[PDB]
Design a binder for these strands. Structure first.
Ligand SMILES: [Ca+2]
Length: 258
DNA sequence: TCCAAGCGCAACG
DNA sequence: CGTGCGCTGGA
């Protein structure tokens, strides 16, 4: 299954097992806002597939000072583990200043990355994680390292897309015309008997992406921003202590009962 | 309303 | 197993 199906899988399990107290609906925040436990002791439940990513922050190379600057537009504050990562990269500036999409791994102790993850998810009121190895596994953030292996890389991650809008619509119709695509527009929705799912076309400094949705195509404008972020990858352990697992399930059952 | 950017997510070649 | 689109301040 994909990660969206996985998250629904997790929510359904929580509600059927522990009562209909776990919400996954409405808008999300610019930070992690996954599953919400809606009881008297509320907290957010972060769902992770066995191979996932797990937080990030953008660093800007300062080639005059040979150090990395924390982006003022980042959405989490510098903690000591942020600082240890930045310090390591800055002391090794020439090794990290040539940005790449393949990334460069950061060889600090794994506990630095685990502690960053703990600090970040705690700050977003994420108190528990849920994952699955065939059985559901629920555990508190303070015990993260008993469940996931963690690594850390610095890589270019292109920013995301945005919806086609009215201002861009003439440009997009002209891009379809130039590419020879047969089409009709219903507002901002695209209709075509051609097979153009995942088609990429460009026009007037905009890269467009076409995606099939129900009975029409939805059109996106891709980003032109290619900044680099420290970003954490996690892999579910194959050797999880059943003792820690059991006490952590009780910790969850306590949290939802307070 | 619109755009650049950062964070969401494992996805995918 | 070694890359980026969908969504969400400030002008
Ligand atoms: Ca990594």
């Amino acid at each position: 299954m994909n990660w969206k199906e996985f998250e629904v899988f997790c929510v359904t399990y929580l509600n059927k097992t522990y009562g209909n107290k776990f919400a996954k609906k409405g808008e999300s925040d610019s930070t992690t806002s996954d599953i919400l436990f809606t009881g008297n002791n509320p907290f957010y439940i972060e769902a992770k597939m066995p191979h996932s990513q797990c937080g990030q922050f953008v660093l800007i190379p300062n080639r005059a000072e040979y150090k990395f600057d924390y982006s003022p537009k980042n959405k989490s504050e510098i903690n000591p583990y942020t600082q240890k990562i930045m310090q390591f990269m800055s002391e090794n500036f020439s090794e990290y200043a040539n940005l790449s999409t393949k990334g460069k791994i950061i060889p600090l102790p794994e506990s630095v990355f685990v502690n960053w993850i703990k600090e970040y998810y705690k700050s977003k009121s994420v108190k528990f994680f849920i994952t699955s190895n065939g059985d559901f596994i629920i555990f508190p953030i303070e015990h993260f390292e008993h469940y996931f292996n963690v690594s850390c890389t610095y890589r270019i991650k292109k920013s995301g897309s945005r919806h086609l809008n009215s201002k861009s619509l003439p440009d997009f119709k002209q891009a379809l015309d130039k590419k020879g695509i047969s089409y009709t527009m219903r507002g901002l929705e695209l209709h075509s008997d051609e097979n153009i799912h995942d088609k990429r076309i460009s026009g007037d400094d905009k890269d467009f992406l076409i995606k099939e949705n129900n009975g029409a195509y939805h059109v996106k404008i891709l980003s032109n921003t290619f900044n680099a972020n420290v970003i954490f990858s996690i892999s579910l352990k194959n050797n999880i202590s059943l003792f820690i697992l059991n006490e952590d399930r009780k910790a969850f059952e306590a949290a939802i009962s307070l």
